[PDB]
């Protein structure tokens, strides 16, 4: 199994079924995805030299799908989307000691858009280094110089633009700030409108490499972001929605994508609201 495609007109009822008896069928479903991708090794991320480069010792990219730096090690994975095979690069939240590698990756891979769906610290627990500059002052990261051009705060996300000088790119950073680790946003609408805003900018980024998405580990809130990005496009696009198949494809690429069942529920809730409203 692989893809479970649902007719738009059937989605609501189907979601109800999954929801019946304390989420019984949904629990069964989320559970079929448990073993997807589990055949794959992570030997490179385990090399001694790379140990300090992983934020979590049990969240490591598959060798088969990892992003290589042109010492080639970053904790990052290529991920297919609705449209192409290297549609996203998914990564952990940079560490103080990996932020130069992360920006080196952004530069080499031609990325114009970065989506961050973690806070750097939540309730005191560290999640992600503050790997861009505090303000308008420029900073080096390895052999790159970065300047923050602009920073617009909104209630639920902040959009920054960076200028990178390498060996003249404008990078847009999309920071959603109210997504609790291991949890889900307080509403469907907030993330639905964030994704739609991000997709709009990605749509307008002619020539861009992969979109970067990260959270803390780069699995749960990252994977939910991307599964949502994928499915909202199917909804505009198609007579079907494939949530199971989105999450399945993600898992073939990186461990634990969509990391709690409640994130999997929340995906179904978002489709349902978009479909109720239309
Ligand atoms: C050593 O680290 C772990 O075991 C963690 C988080 C954790 C949990 C309990 C105690 C310590 C760390 C790693 C982890 C996994 C998912 C997230 N959420 S995400 O940032 O949205 O992907 C954060 C952190 C985990 O859940 O692995 C499956």
């Amino acid at each position: 199994k692989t893809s479970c495609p649902i007719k738009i007109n059937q989605f609501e009822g189907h979601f109800m079924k999954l929801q019946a008896d304390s989420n019984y069928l949904l629990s069964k479903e989320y559970e079929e995805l448990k073993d997807v991708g589990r055949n794959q090794s992570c030997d490179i991320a385990l090399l001694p030299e790379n140990r300090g480069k992983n934020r979590y010792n049990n969240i490591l990219p598959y060798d088969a799908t990892r992003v290589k730096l042109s010492s080639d090690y970053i904790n990052a994975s290529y991920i297919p989307g609705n449209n192409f095979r290297r549609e996203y690069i998914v990564t952990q939240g940079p560490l103080p000691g990996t932020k130069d590698d992360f920006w080196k990756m952004v530069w080499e891979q031609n990325v114009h858009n970065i989506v961050m769906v973690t806070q750097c610290v939540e309730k005191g627990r560290v999640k992600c280094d503050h790997y861009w500059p505090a303000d308008q002052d420029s900073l080096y990261y390895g052999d790159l110089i970065l300047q923050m051009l602009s920073e617009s705060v909104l209630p639920e996300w902040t959009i920054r633009e960076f200028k990178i000088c390498g060996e003249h790119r404008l990078i847009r950073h999309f920071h959603y700030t109210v997504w609790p680790d291991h949890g889900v946003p307080e509403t469907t609408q907030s993330l639905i409108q964030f994704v739609r805003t991000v997709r709009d900018y990605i749509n307008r980024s002619p020539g861009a490499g992969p979109t970067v998405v990260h959270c803390s580990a780069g699995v749960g809130r990252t994977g939910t972001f991307i599964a949502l990005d994928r499915i909202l496009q199917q909804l505009d696009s198609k007579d079907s929605v494939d949530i199971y198949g989105a999450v399945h494809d993600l898992r073939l690429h990186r461990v634990h994508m969509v990391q709690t069942e409640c994130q999997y529920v929340y995906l179904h809730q978002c489709v349902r609201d978009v479909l109720r409203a239309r």
Side-chain angles (χ1 to χ4, degrees):
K1 204 229 254 218
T2 277
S3 81
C4 173
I6 331 241
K7 303 287 146 195
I8 323 274
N9 72 335
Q10 310 215 330
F11 185 85
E12 13 288 296
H14 157 91
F15 192 38
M16 296 174 63
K17 272 198 42 136
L18 263 55
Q19 232 149 10
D21 320 305
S22 262
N23 276 355
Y24 182 77
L25 296 176
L26 193 131
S27 283
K28 281 301 164 86
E29 227 196 35
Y30 180 71
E31 198 77 346
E32 255 155 87
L33 304 158
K34 82 158 160 144
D35 285 337
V36 173
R38 76 169 292 164
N39 39 304
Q40 317 173 93
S41 282
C42 300
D43 301 338
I44 304 289
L46 291 165
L47 286 181
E49 16 118 73
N50 295 327
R51 173 144 234 171
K53 299 168 191 179
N54 295 311
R55 179 171 289 275
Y56 300 115
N57 281 165
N58 65 342
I59 307 286
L60 305 180
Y62 299 135
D63 300 316
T65 60
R66 67 177 188 102
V67 188
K68 300 174 185 183
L69 299 175
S70 97
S71 121
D72 75 356
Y73 184 72
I74 184 168
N75 189 313
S77 312
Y78 298 106
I79 305 295
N82 265 15
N83 314 291
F84 47 101
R85 258 105 166 9
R86 311 184 144 184
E87 197 153 345
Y88 312 98
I89 281 148
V90 140
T91 192
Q92 76 186 8
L95 288 161
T98 70
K99 73 180 164 173
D100 309 345
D101 292 333
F102 160 93
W103 284 117
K104 181 169 170 230
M105 180 185 69
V106 158
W107 181 264
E108 283 176 351
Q109 288 297 312
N110 282 293
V111 159
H112 302 172
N113 300 294
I114 294 168
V115 171
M116 172 167 182
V117 294
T118 193
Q119 300 167 80
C120 295
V121 189
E122 311 186 338
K123 281 162 185 218
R125 308 165 265 236
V126 175
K127 296 299 182 171
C128 184
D129 185 60
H130 192 285
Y131 60 81
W132 64 95
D135 53 34
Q136 303 205 336
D137 286 8
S138 53
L139 285 183
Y140 288 103
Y141 302 92
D143 296 330
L144 304 176
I145 310 200
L146 224 157
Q147 214 167 25
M148 190 166 87
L149 303 186
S150 83
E151 186 191 54
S152 351
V153 187
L154 310 129
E156 285 169 311
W157 53 86
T158 297
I159 305 179
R160 290 143 166 132
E161 268 180 289
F162 306 105
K163 174 184 105 138
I164 295 200
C165 313
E167 277 170 277
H168 205 313
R169 324 213 333 224
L170 296 153
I171 310 308
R172 258 191 189 86
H173 187 260
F174 296 88
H175 191 185
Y176 186 87
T177 42
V178 304
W179 192 342
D181 203 357
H182 315 285
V184 294
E186 194 63 41
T187 78
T188 54
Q189 267 269 42
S190 147
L191 191 63
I192 286 144
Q193 309 313 322
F194 177 79
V195 175
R196 272 184 186 155
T197 315
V198 184
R199 178 48 59 188
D200 198 341
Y201 287 92
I202 294 179
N203 285 343
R204 288 155 181 260
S205 294
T211 295
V212 175
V213 191
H214 77 89
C215 46
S216 190
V219 307
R221 310 176 274 174
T222 290
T224 306
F225 176 88
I226 283 165
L228 189 54
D229 184 36
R230 293 195 58 175
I231 88 222
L232 291 175
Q233 301 171 72
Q234 283 161 24
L235 290 195
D236 294 346
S237 186
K238 278 193 43 193
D239 312 44
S240 283
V241 81
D242 199 15
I243 304 178
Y244 178 95
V247 176
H248 177 282
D249 206 46
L250 280 179
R251 296 272 176 101
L252 285 180
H253 305 274
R254 186 162 169 89
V255 73
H256 309 294
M257 292 293 102
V258 183
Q259 186 253 338
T260 65
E261 171 182 320
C262 168
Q263 283 158 358
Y264 199 63
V265 176
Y266 178 81
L267 293 163
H268 281 74
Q269 294 166 330
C270 285
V271 172
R272 185 213 61 203
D273 300 348
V274 164
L275 292 182
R276 286 175 168 183
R278 108 223 285 238

